[PDB]
Amino acid sequence: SMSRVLQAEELHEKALDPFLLQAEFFEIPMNFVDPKEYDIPGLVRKNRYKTILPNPHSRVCLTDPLSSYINANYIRGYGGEEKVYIATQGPIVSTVADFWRMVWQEHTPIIVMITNCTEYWPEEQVAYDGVEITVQKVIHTEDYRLRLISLKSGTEERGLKHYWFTSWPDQKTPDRAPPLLHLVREVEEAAQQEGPHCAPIIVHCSAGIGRTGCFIATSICCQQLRQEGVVDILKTTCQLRQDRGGMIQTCEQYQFVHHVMSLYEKQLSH
Numbered sequence: 001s002m003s004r005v006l007q008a009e010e011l012h013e014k015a016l017d018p019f020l021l022q023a024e025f026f027e028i029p030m031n032f033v034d035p036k037e038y039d040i041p042g043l044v045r046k047n048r049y050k051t052i053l054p055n056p057h058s059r060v061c062l063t064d065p066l067s068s069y070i071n072a073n074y075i076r077g078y079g080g081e082e083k084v085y086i087a088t089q090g091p092i093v094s095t096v097a098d099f100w101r102m103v104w105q106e107h108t109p110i111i112v113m114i115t116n117c118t119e120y121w122p123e124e125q126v127a128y129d130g131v132e133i134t135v136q137k138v139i140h141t142e143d144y145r146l147r148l149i150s151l152k153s154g155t156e157e158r159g160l161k162h163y164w165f166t167s168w169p170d171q172k173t174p175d176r177a178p179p180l181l182h183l184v185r186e187v188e189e190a191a192q193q194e195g196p197h198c199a200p201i202i203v204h205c206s207a208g209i210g211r212t213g214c215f216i217a218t219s220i221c222c223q224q225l226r227q228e229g230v231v232d233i234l235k236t237t238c239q240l241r242q243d244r245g246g247m248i249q250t251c252e253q254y255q256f257v258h259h260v261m262s263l264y265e266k267q268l269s270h
């Protein structure tokens, strides 16, 4: 268990010191899973990447070893709260139906898709394994497109909000931080609007670890900064790695979370 509690001054300077950031980052274990933990035949058709697999203790199981598998993990939130997010790979043609089965099974109210990563949402309507997916409205904003979706399976109807973030930067410099911070804030407000014990929020792009981990880590540290007046990005990254191997994949991503939190701290202090 690693930790470096940052007050405001050290946060601003830490985000701008790439040598210390890479020294710190590359001491965090990736906690990847041994591929021989999943010896099911035909399971490789359900993974985008051979070596990015779900840690077994936190794996989401659907309800046949193959039929119940999805490359997805429950992720703890701020203060260790269980099941605040699900981190998952972007669906492939072979798993689009499993993905929607997961959304239904978990009562997921919000999906966050992080692009600058797949194609699984319908033009108007589509159905998968008993659940009907209807896009009622599309809201275009500067930083994301929000789709208000209805899920129908039998007599039950549910709402769902799908956030498609389009401003993921190639160069992770501080000028590119505001859109991500805005997405984080809009999603956490939507989640509060669901009321007590919000069901898990699904986050993905391609492998479900890099951009995904940046988004979740920022979300966690925003609550930390508001409640405690500090941020601990190292401890947060360590908690995320225990839940799913590889969360926050690159040092550039690690620095980007520091840039976002440095921005948010300035905003809060005015």
Ligand SMILES: *CC(=O)c1ccc(OCC(=O)O)cc1
Pocket (backbone or CB within 6 Å): 001, 002, 028, 029, 031, 237, 238, 239, 241, 242
């Ligand atoms: C700090 C960190 O990234 C970390 C600490 C401990 C750990 O092992 C937990 C396990 O599931 O065995 C993984 C990652």
Ligand SMILES: *CC(=O)c1ccc(OCC(=O)O)cc1
Pocket (backbone or CB within 6 Å): 018, 021, 022, 250, 251, 252, 254, 255
């Ligand atoms: C965290 C890390 O390893 C890193 C961050 C930024 C950086 O500069 C980019 C460049 O190409 O100069 C190098 C390494």
